[PDB]
From a paper:
The [name] of [name]-[name]-2 ([name], also referred to as 3-chymotrypsin-like protease or 3CLpro) is responsible for the majority of nsp processing, cleaving at 11 conserved sites along the polyprotein including self-excision of [name] by autolytic cleavage of its own N-terminal and C-terminal autoprocessing sites. [name]-[name]-2 [name] is a functional homodimer of two symmetrically disposed protomers that are each 306 residues in length (33.8 kDa). The active site of [name] features a Cys145-His41 catalytic dyad, which orchestrates nucleophilic attack at the carbonyl carbon of the invariant P1 glutamine and the formation of an acyl enzyme intermediate central to efficient peptide cleavage. Using C-terminally substituted [name] chimeras, we have determined X-ray crystallographic structures of [name] in complex with 10 of its 11 viral cleavage sites, bound at full occupancy intermolecularly in trans, within the active site of either the native enzyme and/or a catalytic mutant ([name]).
Residue numbers in the entry:
A (entry chain A): 1 to 306
B (entry chain C): 1 to 302
Write the structure that this text describes.
């Protein structure tokens, strides 16, 4: 029992992290087969970051201006190219530790594990969600760029995030592994702001189910609301609107608990309007929105009476 | 910036997890050099768990009763001995992925990473604190026993916890890697209760320093206190005592932010006596006590 924000074991991704130097800048890269992926702003100097012309910066480079290290093993760079906001370095050696992998672009509300790295070395792992404003509420310092987010299904690693920068409100932005940014952000050291961040309603509901399964049930109401009725309250408290597809996703959690989904919505409604009266839910004083319904299912398996 | 429960990367520990089976009982083992460490209840049926005589149960086993499986390769057990509540199985192959390691017994309030495993196969990793009542609040299902807790210091894995069992409140109980339980618990199926938990005061202060480092500045007040006066309020609010040794541990964070340790004691005293008045600290409406001072510097400094 118990219920924790849990990250995937990071060993497979650790086997892919390398150090990428260009000029005087070191950050992290991802070594898959014979390609190293990393943020293109590794070619900037500290003078270049207000409005870099990345094409112009890159034609000034050659393979000799990149140093890639996989641990103490040197990787000879034999090609480079720029795809959107990621640099792809071709190297003379395919990574023998390459897992089965995919590149996927996740939707807001979906979670993933982050392996934070500095100078090519894994430093920590933790669980994150793509927020509705396309930021990540992470923990990153200077030198973390090129850290990646991922999920593991079976033995296949789905890479979904590569980290580029920190917005001044203390949240983080980055790209998929094809280099397309999540959200309206660009890789420059300019003034940009996260949009208003809303709460992921479906995930809050899944977390409440997790609380019920683990015995925390003080907040339930035998009351049924409607989708339209709930959504009026949702917009008042800056919650993502709830769709019928959200209700479908929560069907299995609903069967295991014997609490219908619109009952749980009425329970969540009452928490929004009245607060939690000084009690906690799963050790938390806030409504938690970074567990997906699948994340809850993996961690709270139960017998079904038939 | 940002502050998050952050575990150490699990790769070096994943290379040590094996599956240990004795009869119809399977749990997790830690393979280091030519030894596998696992909870001794691997040698029990459902019936034995009521009141096991572990010595008599073990002396009835042989090497061949023990199935150790590392991935797709089985290892031969070539000796077995019991150390307190853990079993040490000698295996005929030294783990080529053995990291530099040490075994440490940790104190309440310290944190560690847990690599939850089922059937010898890693499932997930997360941070835990050793509570003052010597339990942890983890996420362990049946079959997770033998999962281990660890810190990584440079190239070295300090193993400090191995999981054994679940208590009636859903908290978890375990041993160090010498098989000595944390807390008054025993590896038998009888009613045992976690003691009254207390808030790890020095960790709360460390978390407040982490807030200020991130920019959450509002709880500060230039009112101050003595250590003896602060603890009087601490006692009443079920907070652990704050020792001079705790004040020393916070010294490095004190000089980073510029806030004297007892000044942050005075601010937390105000937080306890009034509540937070609807605000949050580091995106929490509660005073978080599961980040040590070392955990904070790990996340805010170079």
């Amino acid at each position: 029992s118990g219920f924790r924000k849990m990250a995937f074991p990071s060993g497979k991704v650790e086997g892919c992290m390398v150090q990428v130097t260009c000029g005087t800048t070191t950050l992290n890269g991802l070594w898959l087969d014979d390609v190293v992926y990393c943020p293109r702003h590794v070619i900037c100097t500290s003078e270049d970051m207000l409005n870099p012309n990345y094409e112009d910066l890159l034609i000034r480079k050659s393979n000799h201006n990149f140093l890639v290290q996989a641990g103490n093993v040197q990787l000879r760079v034999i090609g480079h190219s720029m795809q959107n906001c990621v640099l792809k370095l071709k190297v003379d050696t395919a990574n023998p530790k390459t897992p089965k992998y995919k590149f996927v672009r996740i939707q807001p509300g979906q979670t993933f594990s982050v392996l934070a790295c500095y100078n090519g070395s894994p430093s920590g792992v933790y669980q994150c969600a793509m927020r509705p404003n396309f930021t990540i509420k992470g923990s990153f310092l200077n030198g973390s760029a090129g850290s990646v987010g991922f999920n593991i299904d079976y033995d296949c690693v789905s890479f979904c995030y590569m980290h580029h920068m920190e917005l001044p409100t203390g949240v983080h932005a980055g790209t998929d592994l094809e280099g397309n940014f999540y959200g309206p952000f660009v890789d420059r050291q300019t003034a940009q702001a996260a949009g208003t961040d809303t709460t992921i309603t479906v995930n809050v509901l899944a977390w409440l189910y997790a609380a019920v399964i683990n015995g925390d049930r003080w907040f339930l109401n035998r009351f049924t609301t409607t989708l339209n009725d709930f959504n009026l309250v949702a917009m008042k408290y800056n919650y993502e609107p709830l769709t019928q597809d959200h209700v479908d996703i929560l069907g299995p959690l609903s069967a295991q608990t014997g609490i219908a989904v619109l009952d749980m919505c009425a329970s969540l409604k009452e928490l929004l309007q009245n607060g939690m009266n000084g009690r906690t839910i799963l050790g938390s004083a806030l409504l938690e929105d970074e567990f997906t319904p699948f994340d809850v299912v993996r961690q709270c398996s139960a017998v079904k009476l038939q």
